[PDB]
């Protein structure tokens, strides 16, 4: 109905509890492997944040896999930073990690992140 | 790190995509039964929004159930309104549904909703 009321902090409170479930390894259903480093996560959160994961988990065969291996060129620290951003809205962008974070966000199809990385790089030139 | 930047709309964008997955019945993993009416949902979203569902899906036996039956006193329309709120932050509170919505939120242990219902009732007295 058009007469709904809205709770401002609801979406942020849901994301905080989804990250608490990840921290405690509760109902995680996939392992993402990046150059032998392993990251446990929830498929629904990955799909909600990334064009690449949305395409992977809507495929009739890949939706049932419990392990997904990323391209060997992907940096594990860059992936870790982006997985933390998916679950918290906070991005740990630093001079020493920005090139890896940008390349990983291009691969994962996370366009807001790619745009912000490009702007921070352009400001230093 | 304490030098993170934050994307304001990220949590709301994640919740919008979780509701799109629910609409299309993608990776839903539980059916909630309320007086023979059936509602498909994601266990992680239910746990993130409700004290009752958090307790149910952290139990070592109930975590593996694919169907959960609610108490026969629970109203299906009240449950439907609260499930929509979990996935959108919007609550369709009307004079004709407020008593059922409040009783359902007390059972589900959704305290912000219980408080708002009490205030709207107190204003009409």
């Amino acid at each position: 109905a058009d007469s709904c009321i809205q709770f401002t902090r609801h979406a942020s409170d849901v994301l905080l509890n989804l990250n608490r479930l990840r921290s405690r390894d509760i109902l995680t259903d996939v392992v993402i492997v990046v150059s032998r480093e392993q990251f446990r996560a929830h498929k629904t959160v990955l799909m909600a944040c990334s064009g690449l994961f949305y395409s992977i988990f809507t495929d009739q065969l890949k939706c049932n896999l419990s392990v997904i291996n990323l391209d060997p060129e992907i940096n594990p620290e860059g992936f870790c930073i982006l997985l933390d951003f998916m679950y918290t809205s906070r991005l740990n962008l630093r001079e020493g990690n920005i090139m890896a974070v940008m390349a990983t966000a291009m691969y994962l199809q996370m366009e807001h992140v790619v745009d912000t990385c490009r702007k921070f790089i352009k400001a230093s030139e | 790190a304490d030098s993170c930047i934050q994307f304001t709309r990220h949590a709301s964008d994640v919740l919008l995509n979780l509701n799109r997955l629910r609409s299309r019945d993608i990776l839903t993993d539980v059916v909630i039964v309320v007086s023979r009416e059936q509602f498909r949902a994601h266990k992680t979203v239910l746990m993130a929004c409700s004290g009752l569902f958090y307790s149910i899906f952290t139990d070592q036996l109930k975590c593996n159930l694919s169907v959960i039956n609610l108490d026969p006193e629970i109203n299906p329309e009240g449950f439907c309104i609260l499930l929509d709120f979990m996935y959108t932050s919007r609550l369709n509170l009307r004079e004709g549904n407020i008593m059922a919505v409040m009783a359902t939120a007390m059972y589900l242990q959704m305290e912000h909703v219980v408080d708002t219902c009490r205030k709207f009732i107190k204003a009409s007295e």
């Binding site: 009321i5 809205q6 709770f7 401002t8 | 912000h112």
Partner: peptide
């Protein structure tokens, strides 16, 4: 919290 969206 609550607002008119």
């Amino acid at each position: 919290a609550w607002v008119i969206p």
